[model samples]
Target: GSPEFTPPSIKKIIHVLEKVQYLEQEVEEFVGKKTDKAYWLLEEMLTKELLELDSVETGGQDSVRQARKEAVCKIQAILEKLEKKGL
Candidate 1:
C-alpha cells in the first residue's frame, strides 16, 4: 500500500553531479594546474550538495541511501580526480 508521504530524491544529487561532470570535462580541457586546485570551491559546492543529499535521507528500507552511498563513492572518486588533476 501507499505510505502517508514521500521523501527526498536523488535528482538533486544527480543534477549536482551533472554539473560536476560537465565542468570536470571543461577543466580537463582548460589546461588540465594551480588553477585546477581552485576546484575545491566546486568541490565544496559538491560536498555541500552531497551532504544536503545525505540529510534528506529518512527511514523506510532506505533504498535511496543505498544509492546515496553510491553517491559517496562517486564523490570520493570525483574528489580524487579533482585533486589528482588539480595539482
Candidate 2:
C-alpha cells in the first residue's frame, strides 16, 4: 500500500509548524507561543484515526476520507479561535 496521503490542509499545518520550529531558533526575541496547540490536538486525533483505520481493516476509502474531513474540521475550529485571540 501507499505510504498514506497527508491531506494538503494537514500538510499546510505541518509546514507552518516546521516554520515555527525553525523561527524559534533563528529569532531569540520571538517571545510568543510557538507550537500551535490546535495542531497538536489534530495530530493526536489523526493518530487515533490511523489506529481506527488499521483496527477494523474495513470502511475502505470512506473511512480514510471521514478521518481527513474530521481533521480539517478540527483545524478550522482552531483557526477560528486563533483569529479571535488575534494570533
Candidate 3:
C-alpha cells in the first residue's frame, strides 16, 4: 500500500522552474537589477513548500518514494539556480 509520484509530478516541477526562470529573467531585464521582490518572496515560498512536500508519504512503495525523490531533487536544482543570480 503506497501512494505514488511523478510524470505529471516531474512535469509540475518542470513547469514551475521554467515559470520561475522566466520571471527571474524578465524581472531582471525589466528593472535592470536582481530578481523582483515579488519573485524573491515567491522563491522563498517555493523552497519552504519543498519542506511541506516532504511531509507527504507513502505506505511502502519504493518506486513511489524514488520518483518523489527525483521530483524533489529537481526543486533543489531550482534553489541553486536562484542562488546563482543571488535573487
Candidate 4:
C-alpha cells in the first residue's frame, strides 16, 4: 500500500492561532489577569495529547490517531464558540 497522504499545511492554522491568541488575551484583560487559564489548560492538554499521538508506532493501535482527532475537535469547538461571540 502507498504511504499515507498528508497536506503540507492547513490554511486555517494561522487564522485559528491568531484568533485564539487574541481572544485568550482579551479574556485575560477582562479578568485583570495576564493569562487565560482556560485557554492555557486547553492548549496544554491538546499539546500533551498530540505528543502522545506522535509517539505512536506505525501499524499500532488506531487510538493514538483518535486522541489527536479529539484534540482537534476541542480546538474547533473553542473556535466556534469564539466566532459566535464575534471574537
* Model number with the top TM-score: 1
**Worst lDDT window (10 residues) for model 2?**
23-32
Query: Across residues 37-65, which tens digit of lDDT does each residue of candidate 1 receive?
Result: 45656667657757865776367746676
TM-score of each: 0.60, 0.33, 0.48, 0.33
TM-score of 1: 0.60
lDDT of 2 by residue, 1-87 (tens): 566788654464455445434433433332223256654453444345434433533355674466546545544454444344333
Q: Which whole-number lDDT from 0 to 100 does residue 16 have in model 2? A: 43
TM-score of 3: 0.48
lDDT of 1 at 72: 70
Report the Cα lDDT for residue 81, model 1. 67
Local lDDT at 27 for model 1: 47
Clash totals in order: 0, 0, 0, 0
* Model 2, TM vs. native: 0.33
Clashing pairs in 4: none
In model 3, the worst 10-residue window by lDDT is 25-34
57 in model 3: Cα distance from truth in Å? 3.2
lDDT tens per residue, model 4, 52-72: 445545565364456446545
Ranking by TM-score: 1, 3, 2, 4
Inter-residue clash pairs, candidate 3 = none
